[PDB]
Design a protein around this ligand. Structure first.
Ligand SMILES: CC(C)(C)c1ccc(C(=O)NNC(=O)Nc2cccc3ccccc23)cc1[N+](=O)[O-]
Length: 256
């Protein structure tokens, strides 16, 4: 074997901790998550292999060290301008890649449960990678679905059924949060503090008052998709196979 190839220098703090690690020999860059629940995160991470999900390389105990795909483009969070969002073609491309990642996770029976721009990272080519499976869990195993009951996520992104029902299907919840992310990308603001009866902004949406912000900043094509995603009844909410049939989803917008 080549000497020293197992040595990584921690050269930059990425967040809190997660450190940018660079290989002493090869100079390969990886992200190292250093945690002082972790057992489950590592286990699910071992199931993951998709171009729009952060790659898991391995772990070692010292304190646990998770070796993760490094995403040099940073968080999608930083691409969203307050009150503006981003160019619609860029948002569509990110949304395509987000759906690809979420379709993959759901296909292997995993739900992320906390999709939001801080957890969507970008590589050097601005390809989107779903990040951080510390709240993720199994919702399908041996081809049998298990209903969720744990309240978790981030309130502005969380689906209404989590707030009102004891149990709920996992997949519509991830679809909902993706819709909130799409709204954020297109409007540069979140539509409500939380999807509750007591929240005026959410009531306005259910009353279809789309002459109000953020909705009036959003073109009718993507808005129509959002009308199908941000549906209160999770059983009536659009599924991803049908999102893939949506007019805006399929609209040519962005050059290569
Ligand atoms: C709450 C939401 C809507 C979702 C949000 C709002 C703002 C930010 C944010 O401030 N992101 N950080 C940036 O630096 N955004 C910007 C990108 C490009 C041009 C800009 C020009 C001037 C100022 C900021 C700009 C992040 C998020 N969010 O995802 O949680």
């Amino acid at each position: 074997a080549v000497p020293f190839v197992e040595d990584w220098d921690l050269v930059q703090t990425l967040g809190e901790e997660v450190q940018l690690a660079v290989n002493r020999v090869t100079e390969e860059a990886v992200a190292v998550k250093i945690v002082d629940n972790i057992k489950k995160e590592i286990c699910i991470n071992k199931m993951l292999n998709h171009e729009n999900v952060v790659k898991f390389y391995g772990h070692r105990r010292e304190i646990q060290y998770l070796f993760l795909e490094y995403c040099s483009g940073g968080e999608l969070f930083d691409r969203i301008e307050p009150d503006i969002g981003m160019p619609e073609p860029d948002a569509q491309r990110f949304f395509h890649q987000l759906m690809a990642g979420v379709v993959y996770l759901h296909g292997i029976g995993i739900t992320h449960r906390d999709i939001k721009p801080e957890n969507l990272l970008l590589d050097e080519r601005d390809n989107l990678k779903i990040s951080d499976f510390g709240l993720a869990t199994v919702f399908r195993y041996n081809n049998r679905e298990r209903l969720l009951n744990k309240m978790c996520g981030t309130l502005p992104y969380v689906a209404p059924e989590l707030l009102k029902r004891r149990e709920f299907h996992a997949e519509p919840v991830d679809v909902w949060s993706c819709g909130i992310v799409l709204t954020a990308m297109l409007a540069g603001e979140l539509p409500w503090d939380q999807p509750s009866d007591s929240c005026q902004e959410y009531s306005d949406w259910k009353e279809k008052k789309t002459y109000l912000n953020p909705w009036k900043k959003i073109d009718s094509a993507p808005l129509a998709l959002l009308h199908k995603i941000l549906v209160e009844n999770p059983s009536a909410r659009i599924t991803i196979p049908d999102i893939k049939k949506d007019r805006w989803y399929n609209k040519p917008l962005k050059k290569g």
